[PDB]
């Protein structure tokens, strides 16, 4: 049986403030720009509709200095950090941003007649941009959050899948990486493999894997390691109703319609896609730039950061403004306007500021407690005396940024106010 | 007189947690796809605008092992489960989705445009998609929920109904079963019989019976078995105003207009349909993924699950994203784009986590209590020593999934912290 | 080590009211109009989307007339004003206002189908107006607020930036001064240097620097001088989706779409701009015309106004109505309408009522306290015996508007009711 961590983790009154200075990323919100086109190094894909998974590295409390040497006995005790409070400060202004495809696979405007539709062209893909669903989510664990998506199933050897058929859909639970893309109103699925035309969804989610956090597995985790703190805020609606150009693999049954004559002899495209939109970006609907405390967690892990590390998965699509940058191709700006002689760039910026209030915690390593933690994860006992090594995170190192002076910092001031 | 169930049902202090791990269904959101065409098995009509009626099977408490045998006397008592708490974790991403008809019987836009003011005889059906009313309903009973809809009346032998006349609408109170269609903004009505055109409503409700729960009828139930817990939230508006093509069976009276000349000599189509639309899908207005306790019920039955079974009728249209999957006809995807070489499919995915906290309850089977239960339902005494045979439910089996270790499960943790 | 101000600042019971009677500015909301067109002096650029930083000048309390001369010791104690209450009265009616460009660099509407979907050449720029994001922020400090924006980076001499390439974006923290333009939904960016088109954004932000207050920077300020009171309320959405005309330096990768035919043989313009819009200007969402008290502050200064000065950075875009003034070019207004005989002027008006309740405070100048004050700011000891010289602040002089009789003024009555 998994016990609550308060039985074998003793909370003491020693609190610390750990804060990253300033986290800034600038990059193209749709694709990674490789070096060679006139810029040094690769411009990353920095988007607001993208998972920001910070791997917060904490110092080992068993080796660095403490206010009291006699607060614990090193022979029979080992220390661990517990996140007592969090502050995900966002610097950039609230804004809306657009992602779109130059060839968006939409056939007709199924909402109503638009008087701009032309049925003379075979390829009806046009430059279409949408906003996405307004998503804010903040997950703190000592393990990274688990995200679900829909992908192609395995290929059966006995009955092969014929080309053109709908592949079987499986729900894959992966680790939410830094740079994974959040749900956008088009669903959490593998658009690289499920969608072959590369034209049905906008440019950032075109060849990416959109992932939604599987809160059922993180809540149903026995130890509560992957998620002991969570906030959600989602908002979307359908602006424009669109068809999908292509052959209908799932033919409509004859019992569902009455045949006409000519183009109405056979039914048209019946795969319908809505245009997602986070409706209004308001400052009153913000779960960021606000202090959040961890008196009680959802799981058995009550904020205790095992292996001296924390994982903060943050999605903030409320600050999604992609800056538009123009560069004149001529060294003087021309007197008369020529659209050919101006280069247009889209650059999205993410500004993050991570404050945490951590609590020192003594663990009495008795035989039963040691056996329980060994059955939990033996690497804790190996370190006291790295599974997530290939996987990519935004690493923030607060090893030298722990401080006993809480009042020097805003989250520490708020913590001292509430205490 | 029907008494409240708390008079003869004694609630013990022991509780159980019972929860299905994950209920996943992938299927076409508009119709069932027959076998063949690359599918070795059928593709069900899995839709968000559809009744998910789970038949939860509980073990017979008079038979399996208990932590203390001496809590009841088998000679003079019997046991029954009472639902003390529920959590319907609906784990998909929040999203919007469209249902549409390739031949939607809309004449023209009567909202703004100077469209037409005449009878039209040619085929003007257009490929039109709509969203629906954003509704969530959660009903727990020990009997399946009742649903009201409007259908054709019986054929009177004295006065037969002539062909083309409007048949008399009558209110049928059927059973809300799995696969039944929820109200979609077009009304709770049998569209298969009352609409012979098969073109006025989208494909998922074109030949289906849309049913709405008659909350008046199952709250006026003497025993309250069909519904002891209910949550409602409906939200819709009208996007587009549409005239319906065809002959007007009920002619507009001459005292309601003034005749014009020529084209406006006679009134046009006057059957008007709105385009339903759930306004904004927002996460704070969700009544799922939340724990709900059953201290008091609306009726006499206070959550007591007779015949060791439960019925959970769930509609959540707030996660209605139809994933669009396209597959290229050629084995390599060509560099040039051809619209007819990509087969298109729509797949809706439904993901559930049904967690319950049940309370063991003993029944002091005296003469009056036994007579009252026998008058209430004679099958309870026969079981203590199946009317829903043809009805289609999502049968979930929780026979071997009952646990006394409440703190190891999320709903058990929330129940222990709330008590 | 910075300490909270309450340890060395003694709060007295003497309160004062300070209020500018009426602060009115009328000016062209898009640009500054120089003199020479038949009028005296220059019409300033007065816009609602513009930072109003009031430099409030307070009398020096060491020489100010006080009700009790013997309430302190001149030899061992010095005096300072502490802001106890504030009210930013806004006089103009609530309203929406528009700013636009006669040549707005948009290619086509990517919201839906737009027809003539590919403009191959020629000038496409259109006379386009937008509203902006609804922003209300009010910041009081004893130092001016710190605002962030994105500007061009410093070009390296070893690797100069080639013409036409995207310059590196650098986050500059400047001082929020009067006349600075707030972020308007297009991004807190330097539009003078980062957009060579001078056609990308409306005229009021076309050649201006849009700044957003770096709340993280002045919240993490040790002394908390720049911000001890702050209110924010931002609200926006995307009305129209527009595509930026011009050459693309960041070419869309070939693996990220499928090549079309003819006009679709190249990907079109893929830099997308939303149209910002404050959704609804509603009276209960106003954070102005309301009294706010300063019992506790986020920083270490609890409203203490060092150097006998205050800085109130206020933007209120909820009253953004740009009045339209038509003047006929004929001395009699003609009875026959000619479009070219009326001159149109846009004039925006700002009405402000700065109101404060200040508290007298004594500083016991003990040697360690004096050392702490000298370490915080050496100019305080010089004054007790400026860096903001070139900065443009709206200077208001409340040296001769301090009154002990609070009940004669509205904020004094509300303070007496509150206290």
């Amino acid at each position, epitope marked *: 049986a998994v016990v609550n961590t308060d039985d074998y983790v003793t909370r003491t009154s020693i609190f610390y403030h750990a804060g990253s200075s300033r986290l800034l990323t600038v990059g193209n919100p749709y694709f990674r720009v490789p070096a060679g086109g006139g810029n040094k190094q690769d411009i990353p894909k920095v988007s607001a509709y993208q998972y920001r998974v910070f791997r917060v590295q904490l110092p080992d409390p068993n080796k660095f200095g403490l206010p009291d040497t006699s607060i614990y006995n090193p022979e029979t005790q080992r220390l661990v950090w517990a996140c007592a409070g969090v502050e995900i400060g966002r610097g950039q202004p609230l804004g809306v941003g657009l992602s779109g495809h130059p060839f968006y696979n939409k056939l007709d405007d199924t909402e109503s007649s638009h008087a701009a539709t032309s049925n003379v*062209s075979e390829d009806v893909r046009d430059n279409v941009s949408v906003d996405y669903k307004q998503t804010q989510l903040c997950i703190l664990g000592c393990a990274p959050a688990i995200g679900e998506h829909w992908a192609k199933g395995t290929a059966s050897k006995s009955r092969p899948l014929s080309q053109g058929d709908c592949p079987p859909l499986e729900l894959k639970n992966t680790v939410l990486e830094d740079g994974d893309m959040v749900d956008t109103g088009y669903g959490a699925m593998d658009f690289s493999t499920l969608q072959d035309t590369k034209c049905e969804v906008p440019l950032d989610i075109c060849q990416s894997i959109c992932k939604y956090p599987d809160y059922l597995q993180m809540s149903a985790d026995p130890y509560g390691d992957s998620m002991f703190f969570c906030l959600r805020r989602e908002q979307l609606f359908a602006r424009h109703f669109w068809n999908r150009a292509g052959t209908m693999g799932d033919t409509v049954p004859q019992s569902l319609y009455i045949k006409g004559t000519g183009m109405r002899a056979s039914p048209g495209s019946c795969v319908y896609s809505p245009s997602p939109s986070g409706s209004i970006v308001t400052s009153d609907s913000q779960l960021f730039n606000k202090p959040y405390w961890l008196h009680k967690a959802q799981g058995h892990n009550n904020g205790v950061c095992w292996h001296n590390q924390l994982f903060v998965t943050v999605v903030d699509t409320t600050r999604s403004t992609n800056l538009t940058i123009c560069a004149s191709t001529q060294s003087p700006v021309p007197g008369q306007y020529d659209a050919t002689k101006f280069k247009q760039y889209s650059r999205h910026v993410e500004e993050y500021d991570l404050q945490f209030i951590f609590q020192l915690c003594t663990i009495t390593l008795t035989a039963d407690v040691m056996s329980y933690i060994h059955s939990m994860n033996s690497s804790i006992l190996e370190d006291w005396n790295d599974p997530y090594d290939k996987l990519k995170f935004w690493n923030v190192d607060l090893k030298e940024k722990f401080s006993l002076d809480l009042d020097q910092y805003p989250l520490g001031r708020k913590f001292l106010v509430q205490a | 007189a029907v008494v409240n169930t708390d008079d003869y049902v004694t609630r013990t202090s022991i509780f159980y947690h019972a929860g299905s791990s994950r209920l996943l269904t992938v299927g076409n959101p508009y119709f069932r796809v027959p076998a063949g065409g690359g599918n070795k098995q059928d593709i069900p009509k899995v839709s968000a605008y559809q009744y998910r009626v789970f038949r939860v099977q509980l073990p017979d408490p008079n038979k399996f092992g208990l932590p203390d045998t001496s809590i009841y006397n088998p000679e003079t008592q019997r046991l029954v489960w009472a639902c003390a708490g529920v959590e319907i974790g609906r784990g998909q991403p929040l999203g919007v989705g469209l249902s549409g008809h390739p031949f939607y019987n809309k004449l023209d836009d009567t909202e703004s445009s100077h469209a037409a003011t005449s009878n039209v005889s040619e085929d003007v059906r257009d490929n039109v998609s709509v969203d629906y009313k954003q509704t969530q309903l959660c009903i727990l009973g020990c009997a399946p929920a009742i649903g009201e809809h409007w259908a054709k009346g019986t054929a009177s032998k004295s006065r037969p109904l002539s062909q083309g006349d409007c048949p008399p609408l009558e209110l049928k109170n059927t059973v809300l079963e799995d696969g039944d269609m929820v109200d979609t903004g077009y009304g709770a009505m049998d569209f298969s019989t009352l609409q012979d055109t098969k073109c006025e409503v989208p494909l998922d409700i074109c030949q289906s019976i849309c049913k709405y729960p008659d909350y008046l009828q199952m709250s006026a139930d003497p025993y309250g078995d069909s519904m002891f817990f209910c949550l409602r939230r409906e939200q819709l508006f009208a996007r587009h105003f549409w005239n319906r093509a065809g002959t007007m069976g009920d002619t507009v009276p001459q005292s309601l207009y003034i005749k014009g000349t020529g084209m406006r000599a006679s009134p046009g189509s006057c059957v008007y349909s709105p385009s339903p639309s759930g306004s904004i899908v927002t996460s704070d207005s969700q009544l799922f993924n939340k724990p709900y306790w059953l201290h008091k019920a609306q009726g006499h039955n206070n959550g007591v699950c007779w015949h060791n079974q439960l019925f959970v009728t769930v509609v959540d249209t707030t996660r209605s994203t139809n994933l669009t999957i396209c597959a290229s006809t050629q084995s390599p995807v060509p560099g040039q784009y051809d619209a007819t070489k990509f087969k298109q499919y729509s797949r809706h995915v439904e993901e559930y986590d049904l967690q319950f906290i049940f309370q063991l309850c003993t029944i002091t089977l005296t003469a009056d209590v036994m007579s009252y239960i026998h008058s209430m339902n004679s099958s309870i005494l026969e079981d203590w020593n199946d009317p829903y045979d043809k009805l289609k439910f999502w049968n979930v089996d929780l026979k071997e999934k009952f646990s006394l270790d409440l703190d190891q499960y999320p709903l058990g943790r929330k129940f222990l912290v709330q008590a | 080590a910075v300490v909270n101000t309450d340890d060395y600042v003694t709060r007295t019971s003497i309160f004062y009211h300070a209020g500018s009677s009426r602060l009115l500015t009328v000016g062209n909301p898009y640009f500054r109009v120089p003199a020479g067109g038949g009028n005296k002096q220059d019409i300033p650029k007065v816009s609602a989307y513009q930072y109003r930083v009031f430099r409030v000048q307070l009398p020096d309390p060491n020489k100010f007339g006080l009700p009790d001369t013997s309430i302190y010791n001149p030899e061992t104690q010095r005096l300072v004003w502490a802001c106890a209450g504030v009210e930013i009265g806004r006089g103009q009616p609530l309203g929406v206002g528009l700013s636009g460009h006669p040549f707005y660099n948009k290619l086509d509407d990517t919201e839906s189908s737009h027809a003539a979907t590919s403009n191959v050449s020629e000038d496409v720029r259109d006379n386009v107006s937008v509203d902006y994001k609804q922003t209300q922020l009010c910041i009081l400090g004893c130092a001016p607020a710190i605002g962030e924006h994105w500007a061009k980076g410093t070009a390296s001499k070893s690797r100069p930036l080639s013409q036409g390439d995207c310059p590196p974006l650098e986050l500059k923290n400047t001082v929020l001064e009067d006349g600075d333009m707030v972020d308007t939904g297009y991004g807190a960016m330097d539009f003078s240097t980062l957009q060579d088109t001078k056609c990308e954004v409306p005229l009021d932000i076309c050649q201006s620097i849009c700044k957003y207050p770096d709340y993280l920077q002045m919240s993490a300020d040790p002394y908390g001088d720049s911000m001890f009171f702050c209110l924010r309320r931002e609200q926006l959405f995307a009305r129209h989706f527009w595509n930026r005309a011009g050459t693309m330096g960041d070419t869309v990768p070939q693996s990220l779409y499928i090549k079309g035919t*003819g006009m679709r043989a190249s990907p079109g313009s893929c830099v997308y701009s939303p149209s910002p819009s404050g959704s609804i200007v509603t009276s209960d969402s106003q954070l102005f015309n309301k009294p706010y008290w300063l019992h506790k502050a986020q920083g270490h200064n609890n409203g203490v106004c060092w150097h006998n000065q205050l800085f109130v950075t206020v933007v209120d875009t909820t009253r953004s109505t740009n009045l339209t003034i038509c003047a006929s070019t004929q001395s009699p207004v003609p009875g026959q309408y000619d479009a070219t005989k009326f001159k149109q002027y846009s004039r925006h008006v700002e009405e402000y009522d700065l109101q404060f309740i200040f508290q007298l405070c004594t500083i016991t100048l003990t040697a360690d306290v004096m050392s702490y004050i000298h370490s915080m700011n050496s100019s305080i000891l010089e004054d007790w015996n400026d860096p903001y010289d070139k900065l443009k602040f709206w200077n208001v002089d409340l040296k001769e508007k301090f009154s002990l009789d609070l009940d004669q003024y509205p904020l004094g009555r509300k303070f007496l009711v509150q206290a």
Partner: antibody, heavy 122, light 110 residues
């Protein structure tokens, strides 16, 4: 069946205005696009422009300065005006029903007028 | 390509197959639907092929349409004496943004 008829002056003197009208019988005008297409003798067809159902116009750019197309819903007609005609504007003019603007539009001109021969001479 | 390249005339044995070609460019024929029309002097043109292969109601099934690359072809199987008439192709030029038409193909039934 939808039928199109052209009416107008057969002979138009040069530098005057060429006026033609097309009447639709057996169909409605507020549904599809309506185009004017001219064939000079000795050569092929030449597109002029079309009028929408709502009243929006599109034109051939090479004739865009000289072509005005109007629509009359009450008269169920649509008219072509061609100012400053030259000798090259002598042509057989056909009004046609460009099926466009909806989901099941075939594209192109499903129904054609017979056309009227307009000769420009002094 | 303002004028689609068509043969000035075509001939064929009755009962045989006659193919009329129509050459355009990547902006008019390859990227848009081509429509094949039947026109006789003195009568209104009649649509035969729409969306490069489909036929309307009343058009005989012997007429067929194909489109390969930037070229299109109209095939008449079982040539009859009533087919001695002009045929042409029409499509939409995106580069010129107009309706381009073929020069016409007077078919003689020999």
């Amino acid at each position: 069946q939808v039928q199109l008829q052209e009416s107008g002056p057969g002979l138009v003197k040069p530098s005057e205005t060429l006026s033609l009208t097309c009447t639709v019988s057996g169909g409605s005008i507020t549904r599809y696009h309506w185009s004017w297409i001219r064939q000079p003798p000795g050569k092929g067809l030449e597109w002029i422009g079309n009028i929408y159902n709502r009243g929006s116009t599109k034109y051939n750019p090479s004739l865009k300065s000289r072509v005005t197309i109007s629509i009359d819903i009450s008269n169920n007609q649509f008219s072509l005006r061609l100012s400053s005609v030259t000798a090259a504007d002598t042509a057989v003019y056909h009004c046609a029903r460009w099926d466009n603007g909806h989901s099941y539009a075939i594209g192109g001109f499903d129904y054609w007028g017979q056309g009227i021969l307009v000769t420009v001479s002094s | 390509q303002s004028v689609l390249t068509q043969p000035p005339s075509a001939s064929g044995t009755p009962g045989q197959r006659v193919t009329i070609s129509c050459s355009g460019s990547s902006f008019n024929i390859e990227s848009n639907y081509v429509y094949w029309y039947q026109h006789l002097p003195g009568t209104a043109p009649k649509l035969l092929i729409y969306r490069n292969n489909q036929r309307p109601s009343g058009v005989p099934d012997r007429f067929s349409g194909t489109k390969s690359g930037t070229s299109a072809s109209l095939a008449i199987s079982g040539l009859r004496s009533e087919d001695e008439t002009d045929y042409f192709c029409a499509t939409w030029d995106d580069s010129l943004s107009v309706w381009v038409f073929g020069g016409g193909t007077k078919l003689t039934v020999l």
